Design an enzyme around this catalytic site. Structure first.
Site, PDB file in Angstrom:
ATOM      1  N   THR A   1       0.826  -1.243   0.000  1.00 17.88           N
ATOM      2  CA  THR A   1       0.000   0.000   0.000  1.00 17.88           C
ATOM      3  C   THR A   1       0.835   1.257   0.000  1.00 17.88           C
ATOM      4  OG1 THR A   1      -1.931  -0.902   1.144  1.00 17.88           O
ATOM      5  CG2 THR A   1      -1.603   1.456   1.305  1.00 17.88           C
ATOM      6  N   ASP A   4      -2.816   3.957  -4.014  1.00 14.70           N
ATOM      7  CA  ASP A   4      -2.743   2.984  -5.098  1.00 14.70           C
ATOM      8  C   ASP A   4      -4.015   2.158  -4.949  1.00 14.70           C
ATOM      9  OD1 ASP A   4      -1.674   1.403  -2.697  1.00 14.70           O
ATOM     10  OD2 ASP A   4      -1.599  -0.160  -4.238  1.00 14.70           O
ATOM     11  N   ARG A  19      -4.088  -1.549  -5.030  1.00 20.62           N
ATOM     12  CA  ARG A  19      -3.845  -2.969  -4.817  1.00 20.62           C
ATOM     13  C   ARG A  19      -4.216  -3.433  -3.405  1.00 20.62           C
ATOM     14  NH1 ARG A  19       1.842  -5.619  -6.475  1.00 20.62           N
ATOM     15  NH2 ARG A  19       0.862  -5.304  -8.529  1.00 20.62           N
ATOM     16  N   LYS A  51      -8.913   2.918  -1.626  1.00 19.87           N
ATOM     17  CA  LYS A  51      -8.359   3.218  -0.314  1.00 19.87           C
ATOM     18  C   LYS A  51      -8.687   4.626   0.176  1.00 19.87           C
ATOM     19  CE  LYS A  51      -4.745  -0.057  -1.430  1.00 19.87           C
ATOM     20  NZ  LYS A  51      -3.304  -0.332  -1.567  1.00 19.87           N
ATOM     21  N   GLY A  59      -3.100  -0.671   6.013  1.00 14.08           N
ATOM     22  CA  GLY A  59      -3.147  -1.639   7.094  1.00 14.08           C
ATOM     23  C   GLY A  59      -4.201  -2.698   6.846  1.00 14.08           C
ATOM     24  N   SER A  61       3.488   0.005   2.929  1.00 16.92           N
ATOM     25  CA  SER A  61       4.726  -0.608   2.473  1.00 16.92           C
ATOM     26  C   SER A  61       5.386   0.244   1.389  1.00 16.92           C
ATOM     27  CB  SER A  61       4.465  -2.032   1.967  1.00 16.92           C
ATOM     28  OG  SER A  61       3.407  -2.066   1.030  1.00 16.92           O
ATOM     29  N   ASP A  86       7.242  -0.940  -5.018  1.00 21.22           N
ATOM     30  CA  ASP A  86       6.764  -1.753  -3.907  1.00 21.22           C
ATOM     31  C   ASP A  86       5.867  -2.880  -4.414  1.00 21.22           C
ATOM     32  OD1 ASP A  86       6.059  -2.665  -1.329  1.00 21.22           O
ATOM     33  OD2 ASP A  86       4.275  -1.369  -1.313  1.00 21.22           O
ATOM     34  N   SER A 124       2.263  -2.588  -3.536  1.00 19.83           N
ATOM     35  CA  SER A 124       1.464  -1.578  -4.218  1.00 19.83           C
ATOM     36  C   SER A 124       1.407  -1.812  -5.722  1.00 19.83           C
ATOM     37  CB  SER A 124       2.054  -0.193  -3.959  1.00 19.83           C
ATOM     38  OG  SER A 124       2.085   0.098  -2.576  1.00 19.83           O
TER      39      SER A 124
END
Ligand code: GPT
Ligand code: GPT
Ligand code: GPT
Ligand code: GPT
Lengths: 212, 233, 204, 196, 198, 222, 222, 196, 198
Positions: G1, G17, G19, G33, G47, G129, G166, G169
């Protein structure tokens, strides 16, 4: 896994499933669980694929070496003890194997030895090894007769694996058959359990609880 | 099996059109204590290779000694030690990679992450990584520890794939690296403001810069931040 | 140990042209022991369908709970609940047990009776909603299902075509999962009618 | 973290670094660890950011109600409220708090409340991981009744050393001056304090 | 564990349950009846944790007899099994869960058909032609899968069970001291006092 | 405590054709949630018309491949440059792997080539040396996403003749290298959509009687 | 994330993002999100998904009720105080990590809240992340007095740093702009740089391919 | 433990507290942590008493054989022998050692060898649990090329602070002066250094 | 564990050993002979860890046969038991000890008396009128303590064993599948093929 071997009038029947699983993952439905040690000796594989494959193939090499040295066919008792004693040397290291060493010699007749990684070596008439063993035992125990015909014996073995392939989540794929005679073993095919189940259900009338 | 005591943080690097750049700060940490400040973590080998090391410093010093011995040995009965038979960056890396994997295989590793940067004799750029596990890999940009998370994203905005190499100049590249070093000083709690940077160009050779410092930092906006929510003064 | 790996089972839902499909295997085991080949994991309240994978006792409990809740809903609202609304109900019912959750992987499928729009959704054990436009997978063979769906699937398939697709996704995923199989049922859903077909598959 | 409070001739000054970490990552480099619980009663927070924020927020609430009923609270009273919260909940809190306030009758006062919930009134106090490195320095350079300029210097030099050796400390140095004249906010950047 | 088997034939349900009660190193009893009649046409067998086993069985028995008196009616086997499943489903998330597995065999006088329900301590319920709890299924299911027929007579069912018990006595490591067998049909529940050699 | 193992992600695929064989693999190398490289070859030409890939823990994978290549070299030295047949290589690899039975090479290895009859061949191994000749095998992270697909589209599992009431299985007509390459690419783009460790690039090595050829395709980089 | 917040001259912008992952598998390729607490107070969450969503809706509900009770526009500091006290109480068990932003009668605000209940304030922030890839971009391009357009660009680039670098993400970039005197504008899928290439083959099956045992109509009408 | 070595104009001085503990009990209050490995090469020991004694004894042996064959060893060479022993046996040793020696060509030199076995040449070095408290003080008060009197003062003040805050440090302060003039032993008692 | 019993009567020693070999959930064999003849008048029974059991027995058998050939003499039962105790006493402090317990029953042709030795895997040896390994003693010793007489005949000994086995079959939880019985006397070792109903 479900593997079995039994002694009878016509020699020995050896039947195994062909499924490989790691947890709930079906890694394969076409694995070999019978090692052709040599033209006269068969070995079944349960537990660790690598351990059984590696040491049963190595056993083949020891058997050949014996025959070159003694100009005589190795006995099943001796062949099985080579594996047994090897495995025993590794006791505690983590080898994982449940196996049946099957042969038919002039001196011994039809012979089956159960050999596992605990170092256990047992001579017997009937053996089933694997997470599906209890299922195969039920079918085998109630239909086994020393006077079975090579044809019926072959079917019994195939049927016993089918029983296990059905109930045991870790057994299935196909069935591999073998007939062991004093002149060597005879392969009796690969039978996909999918097709085999329906065929047997109809022709036999069993597995009534399954809608077909 | 062991545990690192004195450690060096990130080692970042990348390749441009004529060579490679590699940098590393001069800190030797002892847990949360920023104990040593005159630590050089960039090891030049000959004049075509620079080895940047992060991780346990005692092991780095050990690797240093190994490297000096390689040079000494290679010169033995070698009339071409400074020519056709001089140490190539790729030989140095293969050697270290071999040692790293052997040591992890004996369950007694050299607790480090290493980046070997240099230029081969045919002019080719060389950039490859090896760590305490014996793991190795190459990419247009390479960074260890914290730099892998914060430097790679920045350096990759310059060289995102192979074809971007010939389009990247030493100026652009060195700028990226210097910016990345500043970012690491902002967010990495085990970093230092002082660092060393080295350039290995197939034309200008090896340029080793010592005592660089993170400059042009933004902190003023800090005066405007008070409290953690509702506080006004 | 892992509650979601005791009984086994999978469920998959897909969208198509003016239709939706939801399918499931019929196995119910006790670890390696197969116990029932008639354990359906798809239920429906009015025109809304609910598939549930995971721990069987919870699959049964949740079904009984939602039957109970949608029955009261209909008595007060004087209309059958819609897919969108039910999804919210599933979500909040699951979150209500945030720290002692039902070990399940619900999947909702249906067509909104007023807009005719096809709808599918997935949930994690604590209610997080995944409202996908294409497909939703759940169960002990969900990885296999993702692989099957991501390749076999394509938009606006007609009911008869979506049937073949959903079925091949289900079947081949189940055959790579030791805890799935022993039969399968597929639901083809349209505004006016719904067809249920039982598939023929290996029984090992 | 590196935080300190120092009483001097005209009152008291609170100081602190601005770093909050999550492991070796700097989650926030411009944190404000100097928190107001009353007009002239502030605190320095160390330990858990979540716990100290929650504590402070509750103290502020208690002192606001106290003020509405009995007027301005003494610094000693503020330190007692912090103490009550930190001692009675010691099993579930990780808070190292320094309370500092200016009174007209008492002038400046400093109370330090470490992990157990005990209270200690002192001429000055240092706390946080970075404080370990400046115990010697501070003990040698502190003097009572210093001037505002001298105290700002003592705190700036002490914290710059804490920030230097402690990886858990960094960013800018923040200070809050509490005297009869009022409340003053000070900030010092790296470029300045790093070369002291 | 103990032996708990169930088989639903054409017009009845048969439940076979081991008689041994072992505690550690000694077999304390060899005539234990692991069953409770819930109503004239509903029988429940059980196995599991030492004390929970009977306490649970009797608790269910009490509740069903209370329902029978209040309503002067006998709940259908399906209704009783649902009541039991819910009790176990509450228990699994309680402070100390009942570690009991059961088989409910009942004759539905309204439908005029026998019914067999298998429910574990988690509240997992399933309706089957035949079932078992523990390791019992591992040795007997291959036999039942083979010989089972929906039109079997009570007599054929008993013979099939006998075969299962013989397989259990040959391959199972523990001596469960034989089984007590009970038949449930349109006329109620009766015990086959002669299975020690049928 | 020191952990001698790591996971570099990646996924590999081996498919044997009637007279050819392919061994594919993505080119992404990872550590946790970081990308180490978007292009790090993982499938190698080991000589003698044999391609190999040992996926999982990269350090172990490299050591193995390196050891096997050196094994081919000595095979030549010790047996008058005789060609190492795919089946012999397989048996050889089993011994290399089983030699570390008690400190395994943490990898799933697959080799592809042609048998001695010219037919396409694939062998997949256990981390400790168990092996089997197979039609096709996916290895690594997305293996569980790919195999089901392959059972269906390569071995036509669960597919019957329209109108036969599922009484006649769809005939196993065999695929060409072009058709196989398509399945490989679709396998990887699908895997790339649902598995965070698959992506960046797909490199395929094709083996025929004419040697080893390579093809490369980009994969999503997120 | 990867989620970020960036203040600009006359407001604040947040991005994220799309994902969603269960272990190494992408459970949702286009989740959202960005949550709305009130019309002009939006939240970006990282989270535990069920938690970010549930906590955002709970406080949003209570904020709406408070708004109605006080006849005033909700203030960001209120959402922040309610969220932190709720999260603190649960000692981090509600895995919600949020970036809360919005405009209210007192101006424009940007804050972050961690699962344990601690809050922070800044001109630019990011969690998840992907947090480090994003922050690297922000620490490199942020400047004071950004225009709405510059802010949207910065925030958007910061998210991309995450999508690309990442593994946690990926997919798309969602944005929400909250400007002092206008309506908040939610830009779902502001960027969609990861569209899947056309598949190599169509896997549409010929009708009748699947074997059927039984068939029946399902009754829905009561 | 609190130990340090400081180079100055005429050479170098080693200093240390004299406390050895076993928990909170003072097993020895007059310990000599300054050990001679050669005429003008000494070391400061911290960590395990048993390990550092064993290390030192071996180093002394190595340097004695070195001297018999190649003459007086350099301070760098002594630090290399310590290093070899500490690095190669890092798994079984707990030794924080500072090596200090006087050379005529090199004057005074200080090498610190912490837990891992790494070596660090420095103008001065501090180590031991007590050292944490004087990082700030020492960093502020150290100057290169100080006089003998100044260096003795720097060390006396530094260690008195370490001893003050660290319960693992105490007793008397011992010093060893290494210069061309020879070797001098110094000792300072509590009554003197406590009131500094 | 398995059943290993020994009884020394007036002119012989009798060893009874269970026939079952169970591995986990299944009884793999029900005709296992847990004995090895060490010499014409010396028999050894054994129980313990899966592989160690036979490997140890045969290893001892090999060593005693080698001694017999070399010396053309038969070691006394006491001598053989001492050799065995020492092997086990070395084993207990080795890398991986033999987890095997044994009973050595032999007829001393020089003293003209039967002898029974019990030795556990630690090398603990004792000479007894009757003995056992495992739980066997717990159920049978009270019977032997009561009925045992030094002048018993082989026939009386067999009857006393039969009583012990019956107690074992009644109170022990495991089905050890009966026992194989062997007699050792002045004429050697012979097996009582008829104990399945003696
Ligand atoms: C059966 O024993 C198992 C087989 O996978 C292997 C594979 C090849 C030949 C030897 C037997 N072994 C297992 O570990 C596995 C799961 C057991 F729980 C298996 C499918 O049963
Ligand atoms: C300082 O004590 C720490 C700060 O992050 C918090 C943040 C805001 C005000 C209170 C103090 N606390 C820590 O846990 C952290 C790491 C300690 F190892 C810190 C930087 O030292
Ligand atoms: C990002 O924080 C993560 C997302 O899956 C959730 C999903 C929807 C909105 C809230 C955040 N959270 C995770 O746990 C996951 C992996 C972390 F390693 C994620 C992708 O990073
Ligand atoms: C100092 O390091 C310690 C000293 O006891 C020894 C004794 C003699 C010379 C070497 C150092 N070492 C300790 O372990 C002890 C307690 C530390 F907590 C000490 C006093 O600090």
């Amino acid at each position: 896994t479900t593997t079995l071997a039994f002694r009878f009038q016509g020699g020995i029947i050896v039947a195994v499933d062909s499924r490989a699983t790691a947890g709930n993952w079906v890694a394969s439905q076409t694995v070999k669980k019978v090692i052709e040690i040599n033209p006269f000796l068969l070995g079944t594989m349960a537990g660790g694929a690598a351990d059984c494959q590696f040491w049963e193939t190595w056993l083949g090499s020891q058997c050949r070496l014996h025959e070159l040295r003694e100009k005589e066919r190795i006995s099943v008792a001796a062949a099985s003890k080579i594996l047994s004693n090897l495995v025993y040397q590794y006791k505690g290291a983590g080898l994982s194997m449940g196996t049946m060493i099957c042969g038919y010699t002039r001196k011994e007749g039809p012979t089956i030895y159960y050999v596992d990684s605990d170092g256990t070596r047992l001579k017997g008439d009937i053996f089933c090894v694997g997470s599906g063993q209890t299922f195969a035992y039920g079918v085998l125990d109630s239909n086994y007769k020393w006077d079975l015909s090579v044809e019926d014996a072959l079917y019994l073995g195939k049927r016993s694996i089918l029983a296990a392939a059905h109930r045991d989540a870790y057994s299935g794929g196909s069935v591999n058959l073998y007939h062991v005679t004093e002149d060597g073993w005879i392969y009796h095919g690969n039978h996909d359990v999918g097709e085999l189940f329906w065929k047997v259900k109809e022709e036999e009338g069993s597995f009534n609880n399954v809608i077909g | 099996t062991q545990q690192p005591i004195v450690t060096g943080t990130s080692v970042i690097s990348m390749k441009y059109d004529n060579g490679v750049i590699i940098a590393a700060d001069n800190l030797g940490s002892y847990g949360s204590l920023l104990r040593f400040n005159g630590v050089e973590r960039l090891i030049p080998v000959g004049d075509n290779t620079v080895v940047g090391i992060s991780g346990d410093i005692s092991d780095m010093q050990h690797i240093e000694r190994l490297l000096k011995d390689l040079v000494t040995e290679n010169a033995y009965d070698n009339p071409l030690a400074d020519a056709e038979e001089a140490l190539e960056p790729s030989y140095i890396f293969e050697y270290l990679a071999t040692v790293m994997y052997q040591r992890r295989s004996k369950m007694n590793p050299l607790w480090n992450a290493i980046i070997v940067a240099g230029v081969q004799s045919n002019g080719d750029q060389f950039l490859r990584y090896v760590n305490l596990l014996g793991v190795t890999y190459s990419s247009p940009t390479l960074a260890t520890g914290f730099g892998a998370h914060m430097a790679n994203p920045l350096l990759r905005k310059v060289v995102d794939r192979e074809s971007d190499i010939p389009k990247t100049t030493v100026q652009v590249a060195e700028e990226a690296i210097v910016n990345a070093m500043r970012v690491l000083y902002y967010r990495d709690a085990r970093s230092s403001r002082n660092f060393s940077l080295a350039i290995i160009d197939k034309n200008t050779g090896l340029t080793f810069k010592k005592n660089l410092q993170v400059e042009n930092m933004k902190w003023d906006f800090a005066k405007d931040i008070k409290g953690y929510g509702t506080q006004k003064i | 140990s892992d509650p979601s790996s005791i009984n086994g089972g999978i469920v998959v839902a897909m969208t198509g042209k003016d239709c939706v499909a939801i399918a499931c295997d019929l196995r119910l085991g006790s670890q390696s022991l197969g116990v029932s080949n008639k354990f359906e994991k798809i239920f429906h309240y009015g025109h809304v369908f609910l598939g549930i994978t995971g721990l069987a006792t919870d699959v049964t409990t949740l079904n009984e709970m939602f039957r109970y809740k949608t029955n009261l809903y209909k008595l007060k609202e004087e209309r059958a609940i819609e897919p969108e609304t039910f999804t919210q109900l599933v979500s909040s019912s699951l979150y209500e047990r945030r720290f002692g959750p039902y070990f399940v992987g619900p999947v909702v499928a249906g067509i909104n009776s007023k807009s005719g729009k096809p709808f599918i959704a997935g949930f994690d054990l604590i209610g997080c909603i995944d409202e996908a436009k294409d497909f939703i997978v759940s169960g002990t063979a969900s990885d296999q299902l993702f692989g099957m769906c991501e390749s076999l699937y394509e938009p606006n398939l007609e009911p008869e075509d979506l049937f073949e697709t959903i079925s091949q996704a289900l079947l081949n995923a189940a055959d790579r999962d030791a805890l799935s199989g022993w039969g399968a049922v597929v639901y083809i859903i349209k505004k006016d009618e719904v067809v249920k077909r039982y598939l023929k598959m290996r029984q090992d | 973290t590196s935080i300190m409070a120092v009483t001097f001739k005209d009152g008291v000054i609170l100081g602190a670094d601005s770093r909050t970490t999550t492991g070796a990552y700097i989650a926030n480099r411009v944190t404000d660890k100097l928190t107001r619980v009353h007009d002239k009663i502030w605190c320095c927070r160390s330990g858990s950011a979540a716990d100290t924020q929650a504590i402070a927020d509750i103290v502020q609430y208690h002192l606001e109600l106290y003020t509405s009923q009995y007027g301005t609270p003494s610094t000693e009273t503020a330190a007692s409220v912090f103490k009550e919260l930190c001692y009675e909940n010691k099993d579930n809190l990780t808070a190292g708090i320094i309370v500092a306030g200016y009174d007209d009758k008492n002038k400046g006062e400093v109370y330090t409340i470490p992990l157990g919930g005990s209270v200690h009134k002192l001429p000055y106090a240092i706390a946080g991981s970075g404080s370990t490195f400046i115990y010697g320095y501070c003990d040698k350079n502190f003097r009572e009744n210093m001037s505002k300029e001298e105290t700002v210097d003592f705190i700036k030099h002490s914290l710059s050393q804490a920030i230097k050796w402690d990886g858990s400390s960094g960013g800018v140095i923040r200070m809050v001056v509490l005297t009869a004249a009022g409340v003053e906010r000070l900030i010092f950047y790296p470029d300045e304090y790093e070369q002291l | 564990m103990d032996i708990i088997l169930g088989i639903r034939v054409q017009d009845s349900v048969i439940l076979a349950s081991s008689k041994a009660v072992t505690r550690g190193i000694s077999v304390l009893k060899d005539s234990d009846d692991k069953t409770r009649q819930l109503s004239p046409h509903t029988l429940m067998s059980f196995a599991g944790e030492a004390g929970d086993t009977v306490q649970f069985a009797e608790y269910i028995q009490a509740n069903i007899q209370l329902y029978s008196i209040r309503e002067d009616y006998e709940l259908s086997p399906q209704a009783v099994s649902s009541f039991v499943r819910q009790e176990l489903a509450k228990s699994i998330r309680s402070r100390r869960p009942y570690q009991v597995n059961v088989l409910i065999g009942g004759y539905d006088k309204k439908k005029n058909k026998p019914e067999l329900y298998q429910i574990d301590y988690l509240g997992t319920k399933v309706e089957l032609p035949y079932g078992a709890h523990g390791y019992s299924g591992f040795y007997t299911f291959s036999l039942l899968d083979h010989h089972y027929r929906p039109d079997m007579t009570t007599e054929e069912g008993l013979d099939l069970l006998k075969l299962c018990v013989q397989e259990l006595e040959k391959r199972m490591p523990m001596d469960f001291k034989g089984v007590i067998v009970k038949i449930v049909d349109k006329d109620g529940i009766r015990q086959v006092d002669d299975f020690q050699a049928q | 405590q020191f952990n001698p193992y790591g996971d570099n992600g990646g996924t590999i695929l081996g498919i044997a054709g009637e007279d050819f064989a392919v061994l594919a693999g993505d080119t992404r190398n990872i550590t946790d949630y970081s990308i180490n490289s978007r292009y790090e070859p993982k499938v190698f030409d080991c000589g003698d018309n044999i391609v190999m890939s040992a996926n999982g823990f990269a350090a172990d994978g490299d050591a193995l491949v390196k050891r096997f290549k050196n094994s081919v070299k000595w095979y030549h030295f010790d047996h008058n440059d005789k060609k190492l047949s795919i089946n012999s290589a397989a048996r050889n690899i089993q011994h290399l792997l089983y030699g570390k039975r008690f400190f395994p090479y943490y990898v799933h290895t697959i080799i592809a080539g042609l048998d001695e009859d010219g037919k396409g061949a694939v062998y997949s191994f256990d981390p400790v040396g168990s092996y089997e000749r197979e039609q096709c095998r996916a290895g690594g992270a997305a293996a569980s996403l790919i195999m089901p697909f392959l059972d269906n589209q390569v071995n036509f599992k669960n597919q019957y003749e329209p109108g036969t009431n599922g009484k006649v299985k769809k005939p196993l007509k065999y695929l060409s290298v072009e058709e196989v390459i398509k399945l490989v690419r679709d396998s990887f783009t699908s895997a790339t959509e649902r598995h965070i460790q698959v992506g960046d690039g797909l490199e395929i090595l094709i083996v025929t009687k004419d040697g080893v050829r390579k093809e490369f395709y980009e994969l999503k980089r997120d | 994330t990867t989620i970020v917040g960036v203040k600009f001259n006359n407001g604040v912008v947040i991005a994220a993002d799309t994902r969603s992952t269960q272990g190494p598998i992408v459970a949702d390729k286009n989740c959202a999100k960005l949550h709305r607490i009130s019309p002009k107070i939006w939240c970006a969450g990282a989270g535990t998904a069920a938690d970010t969503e549930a906590v955002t809706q709970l406080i949003g509900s209570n904020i709406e009720l408070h708004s109605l009770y006080t006849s005033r526009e909700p203030r960001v500091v209120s959402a922040l105080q309610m969220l932190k006290q709720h999260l603190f109480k649960y000692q981090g068990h509600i895995g919600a990590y949020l970036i809360v932003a919005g405009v209210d009668p007192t101006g424009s605000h940007l804050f972050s809240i961690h699962a344990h209940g601690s809050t922070d304030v800044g001109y630019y922030l990011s969690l998840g992340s992907g947090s480090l890839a994003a922050m690297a971009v922000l620490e490199s391009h942020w400047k004071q007095d950004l225009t709405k357009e510059e802010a949207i660009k910065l925030a958007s680039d910061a998210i991309q740093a995450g999508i690309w670098n990442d593994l946690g993400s990926g997919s798309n970039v969602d944005v929400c702009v909250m400007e002092i005197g206008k309506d908040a504008e939610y830009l779902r899928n502001y960027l969609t740089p990861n569209v899947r290439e056309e598949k190599q083959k169509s896997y549409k099956f010929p009708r009748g391919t699947t074997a059927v045992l039984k068939e029946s109509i399902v009754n829905i009408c009561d």
